[PDB]
């Protein structure tokens, strides 16, 4: 079946740096559109960035463009996150995600169709 | 919730006719308008692409002929047009005092041939063969008197087959079959497109494919229509076969000056025995090849019918004969003992004539005169397929033959030519602003 | 190469227009023939020009899909239809989407211009 | 129709631009004479392209009119004018608008390089 | 004048290119000529389209300097050296760039693609 | 009537009718037709 | 009218051996003569 395993590091304080990573499994990884999303423990779900299959283009949420990069590497089949400056309100589990996006040769998505099992992230 | 989009450089191609495009890295087969191959053609195989071929409708053939013909065309025009040779002819024996079958063939003539100046004549004797030379009705003329003057080709120009590359032009693409045992029409799943085509040696034969290309496993018979006996039937041999040609007399060339700075050359006196040229093939070479048609032949008209072989006695020598190019000169090889064998449920000699006028593609009206070539003449050569033409409890066929834009299909059967389509249409989620 | 991808489906087949385009360019009958060649593709040229598609190789337009031209969904022609088959397929309607995307660059272009004329 | 708006006002008539566009490009001598298009179509193009028009039928520029061209009103140039009659008004002019638009695109072309040169 | 800034610096020469572009469009062997002129033309227009500078004559591109092409500073490159030199100075390395031109213009067009794909 | 200069006597005018005129023009005799080889491939025709 | 600009500071370099505008001018010039002649009186009786 299709895996999405969340890895990366733990407490970090503020000002700091920290790179997440997501290995993909049981479907081929260029050929979906991927996103990161995050869940805080008193928040909802919420949209973080969104990447193209490709990896060309790449969309943030306001409050990070200044701060956050999302990319993937195809070859390993991985998808990357490095986050900087670390704020209290960015305490959260964050998760990455297939779909939300398509190249155009393929249907419609803008959904998230699987998700992760989450990796905590505490400043 | 879809929109057109528009591509420029689709992979579509249409079945289109265009002019080709000469490669070769004097030769008459040597043509001007032609430039070097590529040093390093590209044959792309095109994967899970499969094309109809047809080669009986490939206009690439006719291209090759219109080449041949003009190339031919434009190199004997600057030559000696022989017009004070129609003349009486002077003739006798040139040895009757022979036991060989060649006495009688050849034909020693006397005649004037105005020297350079108007008001003089140079009598001159030379030899004829037979077959050029007809009786007034002693008194004799050249052949091609009631025909057409007759242009004498430059002896300086080799006539030996250069392999041809066929290029497309820009904008065109020529694809290949690339099957093996493809019968000349239908799908081919194998096709690979190339840039240019490997090269195609114009040789100029009939009933016997020589200097050809060879089949990659077995036998092919190919036929526009196979139970049609009207439709000419072509063999590829898959086994090449080797036949030793030769002219064993030997030969002088005398020359006179008949124009102002126009010579003439012609056949002098035999040295050493008189000889009639041959061809020789081994028998169980062609036992076990001929074996092997009629296997092919026993799939397509079944196993038990009676096959038999006849030779194409009736119609013009340049047609009952087979017509062979052997170092520069035109033999007509009888090749009778080849196609003598009925089929049911060491070597053989080949007889040949030797002519020195001949009339190419069938074009009545052109006659062209061969100069004679020094010594004697040995060749060996590749026979890579057949000519054959048919008429049942038993099916009688022969090599029949005549027309040379089979042979050049022959080679081309496996080549299509096609245009690029680069413009396309297809359906995407994008709208332009 | 040269049609290398002209068995691949269409969507891995997009990637390659360059090789075509490059290709395309690469006694008197051979003069002709270049001459036609050279027409052909201004003739190309000029069509893509009139739908205000300048030198894109893929050009996105404002024309919707009729969906009686072809009803097949985009997942099943782009994945696994060929080029070939996909052309056969629409050979019916090509001169319509021509003459809709010509009149879709007309409009566009008046529409553009007194969108400029504002002050 | 090709040239139908020939005799139409000049209005109407840049409605018709397609038709003309199309129909620019539809035994020596033959080839010599589809050769003499050919350069002339391309030249209309490179002098499209030094304007900066190369992909569009109609452009605007930022050349002002200078009105000693012609200082009839627009209502007066396009309503009651065909495009003989302007032609032949500005026949002594032509040339000069074409230096000028020329000027005029290598100042933008410089311009937006500037522009661009800026991070 | 045609090539009169071939021997100025390479600053001053880019304000002249407009000349030298108007002049390259200006028995059988001359038609020969003119075909042979035409197909030069198309191939140059051809490589701007491939690249997407088919409607200017100075198109700044995304592909990045590699350095290792020449070294020289830029103030060097372009107040000191002239064209001539400059061509000799990068000779070898012209069928890299050209290619790293095509493969920038194809991921471009794709993500202008993906981009209009957004409702 | 057209004519480069109608009072020009060194022009000639032409003149395009409004109405056919049906002409009807034959060589009556019943003539012979002879043919002869002259040269290699070369024939000459003539009035018999 | 002829039209031509100097090239300041441009040290081209020349050959006048390996130039390929003679080798047009000797065949232009041999194309002039031998196609100016062919409309013209074959002398083929003085070889008397
Ligand atoms: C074809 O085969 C015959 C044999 O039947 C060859 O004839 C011999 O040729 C050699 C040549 O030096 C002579 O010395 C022999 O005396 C010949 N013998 C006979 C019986 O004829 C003939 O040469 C062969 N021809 C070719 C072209 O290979
Ligand atoms: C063709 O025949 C003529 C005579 O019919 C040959 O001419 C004679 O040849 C003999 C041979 O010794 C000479 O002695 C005579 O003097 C020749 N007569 C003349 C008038 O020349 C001629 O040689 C024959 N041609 C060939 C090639 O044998
Ligand atoms: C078929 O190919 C053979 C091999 O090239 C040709 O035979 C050669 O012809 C040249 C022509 O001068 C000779 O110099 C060689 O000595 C020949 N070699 C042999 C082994 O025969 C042959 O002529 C070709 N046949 C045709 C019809 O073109
Ligand atoms: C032109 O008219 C004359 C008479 O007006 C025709 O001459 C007659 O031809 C027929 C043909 O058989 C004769 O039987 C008459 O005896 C002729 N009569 C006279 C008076 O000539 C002549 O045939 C007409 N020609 C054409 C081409 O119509
Ligand atoms: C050569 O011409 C003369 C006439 O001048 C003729 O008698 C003689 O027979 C001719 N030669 C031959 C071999 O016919
Ligand atoms: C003379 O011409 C006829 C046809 O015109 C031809 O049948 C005949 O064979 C020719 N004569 C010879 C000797 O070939
Ligand atoms: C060639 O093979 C195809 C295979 O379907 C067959 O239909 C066709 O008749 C064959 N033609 C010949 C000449 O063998
Ligand atoms: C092919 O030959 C057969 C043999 O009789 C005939 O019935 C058939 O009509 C022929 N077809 C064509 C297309 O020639
Ligand atoms: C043809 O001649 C060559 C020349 O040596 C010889 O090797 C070969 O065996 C001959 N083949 C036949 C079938 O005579
Ligand atoms: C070779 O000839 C013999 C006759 O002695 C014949 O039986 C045999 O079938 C022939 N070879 C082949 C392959 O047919
Ligand atoms: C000939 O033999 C083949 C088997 O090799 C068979 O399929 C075919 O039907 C046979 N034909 C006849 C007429 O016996
Ligand atoms: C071949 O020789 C035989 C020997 O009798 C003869 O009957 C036949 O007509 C000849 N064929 C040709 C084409 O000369
Ligand atoms: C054909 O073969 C028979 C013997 O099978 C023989 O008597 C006859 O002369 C041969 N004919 C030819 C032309 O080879
Ligand atoms: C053939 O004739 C030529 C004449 O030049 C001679 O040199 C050569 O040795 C002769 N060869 C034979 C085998 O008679
Ligand atoms: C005949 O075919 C063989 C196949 O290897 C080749 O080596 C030989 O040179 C060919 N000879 C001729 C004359 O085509
Ligand atoms: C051809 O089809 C096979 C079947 O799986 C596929 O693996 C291959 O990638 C295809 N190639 C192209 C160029 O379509
Ligand atoms: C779509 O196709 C139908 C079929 O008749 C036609 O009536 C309709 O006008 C078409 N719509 C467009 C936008 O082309
Ligand atoms: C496309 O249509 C085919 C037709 O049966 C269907 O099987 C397939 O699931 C469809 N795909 C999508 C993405 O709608
Ligand atoms: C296109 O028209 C042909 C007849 O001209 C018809 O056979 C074919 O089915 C048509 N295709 C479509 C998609 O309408
Ligand atoms: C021609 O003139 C008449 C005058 O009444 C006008 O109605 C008509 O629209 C004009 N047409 C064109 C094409 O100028
Ligand atoms: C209009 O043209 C005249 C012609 O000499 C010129 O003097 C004047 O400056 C021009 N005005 C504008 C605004 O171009
Ligand atoms: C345009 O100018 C003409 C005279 O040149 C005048 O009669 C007409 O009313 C003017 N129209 C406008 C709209 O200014
Ligand atoms: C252009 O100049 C010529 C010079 O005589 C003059 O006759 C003509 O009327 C002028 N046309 C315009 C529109 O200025
Ligand atoms: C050549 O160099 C001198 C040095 O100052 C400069 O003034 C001149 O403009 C240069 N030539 C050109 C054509 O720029
Ligand atoms: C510069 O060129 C070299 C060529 O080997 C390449 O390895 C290097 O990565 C290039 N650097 C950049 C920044 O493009
Ligand atoms: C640029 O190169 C020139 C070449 O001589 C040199 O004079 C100049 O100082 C260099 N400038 C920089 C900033 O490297
Ligand atoms: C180009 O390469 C050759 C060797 O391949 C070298 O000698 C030459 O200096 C190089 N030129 C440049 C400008 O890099
Ligand atoms: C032709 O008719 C026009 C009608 O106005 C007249 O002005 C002209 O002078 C006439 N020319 C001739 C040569 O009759
Ligand atoms: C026309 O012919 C008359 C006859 O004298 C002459 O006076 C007049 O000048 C001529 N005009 C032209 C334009 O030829």
């Known amino acids: 079946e299709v895996q999405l395993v969340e890895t990366g590091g733990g407490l970090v304080q503020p000002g700091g740096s920290l790179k997440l990573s997501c290995r993909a499994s049981?479907?081929?990884?260029?050929?979906?559109?991927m996103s990161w999303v995050r869940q805080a423990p008193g928040k909802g779900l919420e949209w973080v960035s969104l990447?193209?299959?490709?990896?060309?283009?790449?969309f943030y949420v306001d409050s990070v463009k200044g701060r956050f990069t999302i990319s993937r590497d195809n070859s390993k089949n991985t998808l990357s996150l490095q986050m900087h400056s670390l704020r209290d309100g960015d305490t959260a589990v964050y998760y990455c995600?297939?779909?939300?996006?398509?190249?155009?040769?393929?249907?419609?998505?803008?959904?998230?169709?699987?998700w992760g099992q989450g990796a905590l992230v505490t400043v | 919730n879809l929109w057109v989009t528009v591509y420029y450089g689709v992979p579509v191609w249409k079945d289109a006719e265009t002019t080709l495009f000469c490669a070769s890295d004097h030769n008459v087969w040597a043509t001007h308008a032609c430039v070097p191959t590529d040093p390093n053609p590209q044959e792309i195989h095109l994967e899970n692409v499969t094309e109809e071929f047809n080669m009986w409708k490939n206009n690439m053939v006719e291209q090759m002929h219109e080449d041949i013909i003009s190339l031919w065309d434009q190199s004997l025009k600057p030559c000696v047009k022989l017009t004070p040779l129609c003349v009486t002819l002077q003739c006798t024996n040139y040895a009757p005092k022979l036991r060989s079958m060649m006495r009688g063939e050849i034909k020693n003539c006397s005649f004037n041939m105005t020297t350079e100046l108007r008001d003089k004549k140079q009598k001159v004797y030379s030899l004829f063969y037979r077959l050029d030379v007809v009786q007034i009705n002693k008194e004799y003329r050249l052949i091609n008197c009631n025909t057409s003057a007759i242009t004498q080709a430059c002896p300086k120009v080799s006539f030996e087959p250069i392999p041809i590359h066929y290029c497309a032009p820009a904008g065109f693409a020529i694809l290949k079959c690339k099957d093996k045992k493809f019968n000349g029409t239908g799908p081919c799943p194998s096709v690979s497109t190339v840039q240019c085509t490997h090269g195609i040696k114009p040789v100029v034969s009939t009933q016997l494919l020589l200097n050809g290309s060879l089949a990659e496993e077995e036998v092919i018979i190919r036929s526009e229509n196979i139970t049609n006996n009207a439709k000419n039937i072509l063999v590829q041999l898959n086994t090449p076969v080797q036949i030793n040609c030769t002219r064993p007399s030997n030969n002088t060339v005398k020359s006179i000056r008949i124009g102002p700075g126009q010579a003439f050359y012609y056949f002098g006196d035999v040295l050493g025995h008189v000889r009639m040229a041959h061809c020789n093939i081994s028998k169980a070479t062609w036992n076990e090849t001929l074996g092997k048609v009629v296997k092919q032949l026993r799939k397509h008209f079944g196993n038990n019918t009676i096959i038999r072989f006849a030779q194409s006695s009736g119609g013009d020598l340049e047609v009952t004969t087979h017509s062979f190019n052997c170092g520069g000169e035109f033999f007509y090889c009888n090749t009778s003992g080849l196609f003598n064998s009925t089929w049911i449920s060491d070597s053989l000699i080949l007889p040949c004539w030797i002519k020195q006028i001949i009339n190419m593609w069938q074009r009545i009206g052109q006659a062209m005169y061969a100069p004679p070539i020094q010594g004697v003449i040995r060749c060996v050569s590749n026979i890579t397929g057949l000519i054959l033409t048919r008429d049942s409890t038993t099916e009688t066929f022969r090599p029949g033959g005549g027309d040379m834009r089979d042979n050049w299909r022959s080679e081309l059967y496996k080549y299509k030519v096609v245009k690029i389509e680069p413009l396309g249409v297809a359906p995407t989620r994008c709208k332009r602003r | 190469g040269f049609l290398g991808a002209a068995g691949s489906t269409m969507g891995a087949a997009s990637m390659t227009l360059t090789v075509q385009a490059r290709n395309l360019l690469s006694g008197i009958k051979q003069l002709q023939a270049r001459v036609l060649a050279v027409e052909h593709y201004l003739r190309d040229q000029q069509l893509l020009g009139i739908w205000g598609c300048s030198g894109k190789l893929i050009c996105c337009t404002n024309v919707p899909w009729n969906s009686s031209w072809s009803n097949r969904n985009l997942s099943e022609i782009w994945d696994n239809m060929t080029w070939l088959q996909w052309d056969k397929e629409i050979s019916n309607y090509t001169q319509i989407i021509y003459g809709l995307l010509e009149e879709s660059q007309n409009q566009q272009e008046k529409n553009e211009q007194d969108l400029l004329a504002l002050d | 129709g090709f040239l139908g708006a020939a005799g139409s006002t000049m209005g109407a008539a840049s409605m018709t631009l397609t038709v003309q566009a199309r129909n620019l490009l539809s035994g020596i001598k033959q080839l010599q004479a589809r050769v003499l298009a050919v350069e002339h179509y391309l030249r209309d193009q490179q002098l499209l392209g030094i304007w900066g028009c190369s992909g569009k039928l109609i452009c605007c520029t930022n050349v002002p009119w200078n009105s000693s061209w012609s200082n009839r009103n627009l209502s007066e140039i396009w309503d009651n004018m065909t495009w003989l009659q302007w032609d032949k008004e500005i026949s002594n002019y032509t040339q000069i608008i074409y230096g000028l638009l020329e000027e005029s695109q290598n100042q933008q072309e410089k311009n937006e390089q500037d522009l661009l040169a800026l991070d | 004048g045609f090539l009169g800034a071939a021997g100025s610096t390479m600053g001053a020469a880019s304000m002249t290119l407009t000349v030298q572009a108007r002049n390259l469009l200006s028995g059988i062997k001359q038609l020969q000529a003119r075909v042979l002129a035409v197909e030069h033309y198309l191939r140059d227009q051809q490589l701007l389209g491939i690249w997407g500078c088919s409607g200017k004559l100075i198109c700044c591109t995304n592909v990045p300097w590699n350095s290792s092409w020449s070294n020289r500073n830029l103030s060097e490159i372009w107040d000191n050296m002239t064209w001539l030199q400059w061509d000799k100075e990068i000779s070898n390395y012209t069928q890299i760039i050209y290619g790293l031109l095509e493969e920038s213009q194809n991921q471009q067009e794709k993500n202008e693609q993906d981009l209009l794909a957004l409702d | 009537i057209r004519s480069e200069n109608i009072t020009n006597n060194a022009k000639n005018i032409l003149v395009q009718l409004n109405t056919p005129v049906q002409i009807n023009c034959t060589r009556p005799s019943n003539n012979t037709v002879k043919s002869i080889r002259i040269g290699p491939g070369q024939a000459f025709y003539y009035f018999g | 009218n002829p039209q031509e600009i100097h090239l300041e500071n441009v040290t081209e370099e020349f050959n006048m051996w390996k130039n390929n505008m003679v080798e047009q001018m000797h065949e232009d010039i041999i194309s002039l003569w031998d196609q100016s002649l062919k409309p013209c009186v074959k002398l083929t009786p003085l070889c008397v």
């Open positions: 995600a297939t779909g939300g996006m398509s190249s155009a040769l393929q249907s419609s998505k803008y959904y998230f169709d699987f």
């Open positions: 049981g479907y081929t990884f260029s050929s979906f559109a």
């Open positions: 990447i193209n299959d490709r990896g060309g283009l790449t």
